[PDB]
Amino acid sequence: RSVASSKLWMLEFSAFLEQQQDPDTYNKHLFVHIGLEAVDIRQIYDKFPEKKGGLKDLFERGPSNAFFLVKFWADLNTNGSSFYGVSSQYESPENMIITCSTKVCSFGKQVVEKVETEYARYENGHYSYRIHRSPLCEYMINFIHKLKHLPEKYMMNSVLENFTILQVVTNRDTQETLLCIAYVFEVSASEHGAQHHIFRLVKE
Amino acid sequence: DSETDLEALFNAVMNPKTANVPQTVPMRLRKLPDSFFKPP
Numbered sequence: 451r452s453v454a455s456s457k458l459w460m461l462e463f464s465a466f467l468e469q470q471q472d473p474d475t476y477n478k479h480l481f482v483h484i485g486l487e488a489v490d491i492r493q494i495y496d497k498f499p500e501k502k503g504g505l506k507d508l509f510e511r512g513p514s515n516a517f518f519l520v521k522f523w524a525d526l527n528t529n530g531s532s533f534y535g536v537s538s539q540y541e542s543p544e545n546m547i548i549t550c551s552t553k554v555c556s557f558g559k560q561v562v563e564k565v566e567t568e569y570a571r572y573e574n575g576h577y578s579y580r581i582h583r584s585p586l587c588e589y590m591i592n593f594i595h596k597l598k599h600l601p602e603k604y605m606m607n608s609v610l611e612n613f614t615i616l617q618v619v620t621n622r623d624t625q626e627t628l629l630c631i632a633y634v635f636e637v638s639a640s641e642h643g644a645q646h647h648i649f650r651l652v653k654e
Numbered sequence: 655d656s657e658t659d660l661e662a663l664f665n666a667v668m669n670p671k672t673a674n675v676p677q678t679v680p681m682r683l684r685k686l687p688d689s690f691f692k693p694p
């Protein structure tokens with residue numbers, strides 16, 4: 451239970467490209483996937499939207515155990531029949547209606563937001579929430595395309611220095627922050643492909 | 655005044671002479687754990 455608050459646990463998260471070779475044949479490439487050291491949140495406030503409802507405001511409202519920072523090393527090594535998708539799975543002891551708000555940011559400024567409402571399914575004593583094969587927004591598709599066309603890996607990392615994603619999962623009725631995940635990216639250079647590290651966000 | 659739009663983002667790195675984006679502190683120069691910069 452890494453990315454987990456008292457109320458909600460993210461078991462899985464992935465962004466991928468699926469290509470249909472033929473009617474019966476599919477190839478899937480994972481850009482990033484999940485399937486704890488502390489970071490001072492003040493060191494990252496400039497990288498996310500601020501003011502009301504922003505990262506500082508959300509953190510101050512708490513609970514503090516709902517706040518995480520994920521560092522991804524993305525695997526960008528991949529090639530009409532293309533689908534860019536995102537999937538995630540969550541578990542909770544409580545039967546809630548939850549909203550997942552995902553904000554893509556450049557220089558700490560929101561450029562696009564995707565919002566999904568998710569209902570519970572009873573599963574072996576707990577409740578399960580799944581976002582299955584959500585279409586990745588055009589901005590992100592275009593961003594990946596432009597990234598891949600950069601001549602050098604250092605150039606890709608330079609662009610990514612100012613690119614962040616903020617995911618806020620909320621109980622729709624109460625507006626309680628169930629999970630808040632700040633995402634930071636570099637390009638993977640490893641032979642093992644996509645890698646990650648998860649940190650707890652703390653006040654100081 | 656500096657731009658935040660997509661083309662400007664990539665232009666700033668492709669053609670640094672014409673870069674017109676906000677200037678920021680690189681993550682590597684910030685107070686962050688070693689594991690932030692070294693993959694597992």
Ligand SMILES: *C(=O)CCCCCCCCCCCCC
Nearest residue numbers: 465481524536554564586587635
């Ligand atoms: C569009 O509506 C925004 C949705 C963004 C979903 C987050 C998926 C994470 C993308 C990882 C790809 C790696 C890019 C360097």
